[PDB]
JSON list of C-alpha atoms and ligand atoms in Angstrom, two decimals:
[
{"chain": "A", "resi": 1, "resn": "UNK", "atom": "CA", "xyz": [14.68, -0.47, -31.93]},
{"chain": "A", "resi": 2, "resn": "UNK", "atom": "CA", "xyz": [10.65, -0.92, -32.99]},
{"chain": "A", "resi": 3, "resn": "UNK", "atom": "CA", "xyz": [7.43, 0.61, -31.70]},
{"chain": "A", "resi": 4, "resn": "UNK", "atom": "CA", "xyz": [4.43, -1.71, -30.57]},
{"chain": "A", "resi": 5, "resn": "UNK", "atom": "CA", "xyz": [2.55, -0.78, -33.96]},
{"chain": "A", "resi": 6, "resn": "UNK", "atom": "CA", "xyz": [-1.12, -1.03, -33.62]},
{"chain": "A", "resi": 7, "resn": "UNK", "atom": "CA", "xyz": [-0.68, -4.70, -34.05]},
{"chain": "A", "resi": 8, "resn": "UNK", "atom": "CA", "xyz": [-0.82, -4.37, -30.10]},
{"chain": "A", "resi": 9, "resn": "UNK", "atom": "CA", "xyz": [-3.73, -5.08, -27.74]},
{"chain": "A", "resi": 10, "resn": "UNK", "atom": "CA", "xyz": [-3.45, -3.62, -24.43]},
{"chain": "A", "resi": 11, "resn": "UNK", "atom": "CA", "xyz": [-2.77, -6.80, -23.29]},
{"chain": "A", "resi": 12, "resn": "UNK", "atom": "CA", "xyz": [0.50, -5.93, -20.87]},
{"chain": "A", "resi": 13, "resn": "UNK", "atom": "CA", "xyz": [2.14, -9.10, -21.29]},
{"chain": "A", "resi": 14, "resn": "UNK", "atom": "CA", "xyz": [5.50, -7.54, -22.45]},
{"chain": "A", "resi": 15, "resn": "UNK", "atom": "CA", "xyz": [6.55, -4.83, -20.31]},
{"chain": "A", "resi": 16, "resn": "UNK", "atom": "CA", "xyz": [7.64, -7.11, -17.43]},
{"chain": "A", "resi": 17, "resn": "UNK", "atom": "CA", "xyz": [9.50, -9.24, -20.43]},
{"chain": "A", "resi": 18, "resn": "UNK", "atom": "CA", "xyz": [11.84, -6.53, -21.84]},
{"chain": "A", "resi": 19, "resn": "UNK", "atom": "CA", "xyz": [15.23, -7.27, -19.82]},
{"chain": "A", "resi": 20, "resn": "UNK", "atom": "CA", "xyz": [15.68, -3.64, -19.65]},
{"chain": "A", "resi": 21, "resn": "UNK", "atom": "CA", "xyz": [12.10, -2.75, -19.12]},
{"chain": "A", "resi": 22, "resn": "UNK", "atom": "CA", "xyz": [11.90, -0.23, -21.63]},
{"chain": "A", "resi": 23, "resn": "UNK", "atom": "CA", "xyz": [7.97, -0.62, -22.31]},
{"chain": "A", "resi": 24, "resn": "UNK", "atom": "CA", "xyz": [4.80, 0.63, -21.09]},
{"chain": "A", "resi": 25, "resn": "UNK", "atom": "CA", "xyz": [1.68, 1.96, -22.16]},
{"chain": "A", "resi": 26, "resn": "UNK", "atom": "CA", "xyz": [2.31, 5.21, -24.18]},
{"chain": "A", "resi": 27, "resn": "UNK", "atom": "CA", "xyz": [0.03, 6.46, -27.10]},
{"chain": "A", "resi": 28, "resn": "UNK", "atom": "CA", "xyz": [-2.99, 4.21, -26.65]},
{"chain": "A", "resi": 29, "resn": "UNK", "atom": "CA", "xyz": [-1.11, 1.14, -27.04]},
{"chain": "A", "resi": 30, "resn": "UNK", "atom": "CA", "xyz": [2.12, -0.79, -25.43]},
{"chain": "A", "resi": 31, "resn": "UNK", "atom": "CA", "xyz": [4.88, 1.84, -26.17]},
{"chain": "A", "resi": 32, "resn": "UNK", "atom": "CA", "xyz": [9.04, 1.60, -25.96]},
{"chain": "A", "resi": 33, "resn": "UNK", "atom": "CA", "xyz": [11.47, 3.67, -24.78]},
{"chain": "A", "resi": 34, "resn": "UNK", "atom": "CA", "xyz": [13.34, 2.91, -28.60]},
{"chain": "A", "resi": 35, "resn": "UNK", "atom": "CA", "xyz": [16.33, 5.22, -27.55]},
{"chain": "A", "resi": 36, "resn": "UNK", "atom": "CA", "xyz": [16.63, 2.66, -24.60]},
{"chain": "A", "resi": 37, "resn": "UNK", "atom": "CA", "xyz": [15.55, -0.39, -26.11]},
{"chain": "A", "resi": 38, "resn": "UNK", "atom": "CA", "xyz": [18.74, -2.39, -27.60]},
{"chain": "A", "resi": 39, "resn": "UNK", "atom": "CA", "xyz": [17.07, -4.89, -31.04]},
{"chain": "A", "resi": 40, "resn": "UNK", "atom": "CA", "xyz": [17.47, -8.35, -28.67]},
{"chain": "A", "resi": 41, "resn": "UNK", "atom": "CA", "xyz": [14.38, -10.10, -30.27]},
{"chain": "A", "resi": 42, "resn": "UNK", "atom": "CA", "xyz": [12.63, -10.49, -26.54]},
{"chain": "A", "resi": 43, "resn": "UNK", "atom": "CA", "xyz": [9.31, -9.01, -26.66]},
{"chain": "A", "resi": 44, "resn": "UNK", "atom": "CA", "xyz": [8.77, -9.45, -30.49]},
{"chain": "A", "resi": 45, "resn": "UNK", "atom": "CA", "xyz": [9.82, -13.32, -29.23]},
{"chain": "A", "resi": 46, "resn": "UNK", "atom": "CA", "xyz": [6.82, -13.47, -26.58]},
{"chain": "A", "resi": 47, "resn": "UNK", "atom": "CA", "xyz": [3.91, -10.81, -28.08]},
{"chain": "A", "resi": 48, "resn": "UNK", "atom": "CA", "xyz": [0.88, -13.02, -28.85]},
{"chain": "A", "resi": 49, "resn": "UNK", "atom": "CA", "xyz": [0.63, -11.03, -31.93]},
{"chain": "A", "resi": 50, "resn": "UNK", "atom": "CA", "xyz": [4.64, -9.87, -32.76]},
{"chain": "A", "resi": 51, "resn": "UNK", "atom": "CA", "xyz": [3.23, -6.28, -32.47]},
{"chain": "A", "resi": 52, "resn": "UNK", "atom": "CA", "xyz": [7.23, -5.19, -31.14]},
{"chain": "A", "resi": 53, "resn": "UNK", "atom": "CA", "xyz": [7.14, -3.81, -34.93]},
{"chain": "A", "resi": 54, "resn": "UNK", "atom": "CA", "xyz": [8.46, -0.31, -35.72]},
{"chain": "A", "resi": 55, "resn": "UNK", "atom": "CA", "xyz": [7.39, 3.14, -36.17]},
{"chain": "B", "resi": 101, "resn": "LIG", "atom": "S1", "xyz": [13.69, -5.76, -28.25]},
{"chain": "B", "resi": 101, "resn": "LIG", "atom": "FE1", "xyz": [14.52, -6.40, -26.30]},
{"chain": "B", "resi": 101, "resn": "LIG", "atom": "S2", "xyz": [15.35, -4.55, -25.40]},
{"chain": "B", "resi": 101, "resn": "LIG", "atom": "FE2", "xyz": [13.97, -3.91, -27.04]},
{"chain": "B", "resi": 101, "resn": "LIG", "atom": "S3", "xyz": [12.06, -3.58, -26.00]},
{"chain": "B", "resi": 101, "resn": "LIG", "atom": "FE3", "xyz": [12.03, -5.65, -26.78]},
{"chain": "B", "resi": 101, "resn": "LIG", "atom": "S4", "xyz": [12.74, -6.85, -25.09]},
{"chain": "B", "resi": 101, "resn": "LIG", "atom": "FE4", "xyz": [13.30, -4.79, -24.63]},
{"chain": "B", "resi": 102, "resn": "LIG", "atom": "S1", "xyz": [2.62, -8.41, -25.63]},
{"chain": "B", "resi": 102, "resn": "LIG", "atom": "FE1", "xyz": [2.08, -7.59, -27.58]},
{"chain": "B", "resi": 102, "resn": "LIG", "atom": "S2", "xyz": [-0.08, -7.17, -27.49]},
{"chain": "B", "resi": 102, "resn": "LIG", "atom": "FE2", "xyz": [0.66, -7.45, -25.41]},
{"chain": "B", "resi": 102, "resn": "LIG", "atom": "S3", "xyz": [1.10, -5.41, -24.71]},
{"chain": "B", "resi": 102, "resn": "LIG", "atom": "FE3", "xyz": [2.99, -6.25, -25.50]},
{"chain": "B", "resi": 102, "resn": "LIG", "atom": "S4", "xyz": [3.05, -5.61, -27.61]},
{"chain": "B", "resi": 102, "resn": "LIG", "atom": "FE4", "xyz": [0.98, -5.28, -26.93]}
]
């Protein structure tokens, strides 16, 4: 599992995209739910800016 680092923009366009939905907006930013999130590549595949990058 990653974060959305600050690489992210608000932008929204990954929540939806996570098969298990384990995103929204958390800290400022996009955030996960890491402890849900399984490492499948989706998200850090679509992000504009591959901000599915880890804290
Ligand atoms: S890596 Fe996959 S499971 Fe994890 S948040 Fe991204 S899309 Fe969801
Ligand atoms: S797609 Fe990227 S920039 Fe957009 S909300 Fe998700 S992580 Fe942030």
């Amino acid at each position: 599992a990653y974060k959305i680092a600050d690489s992210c923009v608000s932008c929204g366009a990954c929540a939806s995209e996570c098969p298990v939905n384990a995103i929204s907006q958390g800290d400022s930013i996009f955030v996960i739910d890491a402890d849900t999130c399984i490492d499948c590549g989706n998200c850090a595949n679509v992000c504009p800016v591959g901000a599915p990058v880890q804290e």
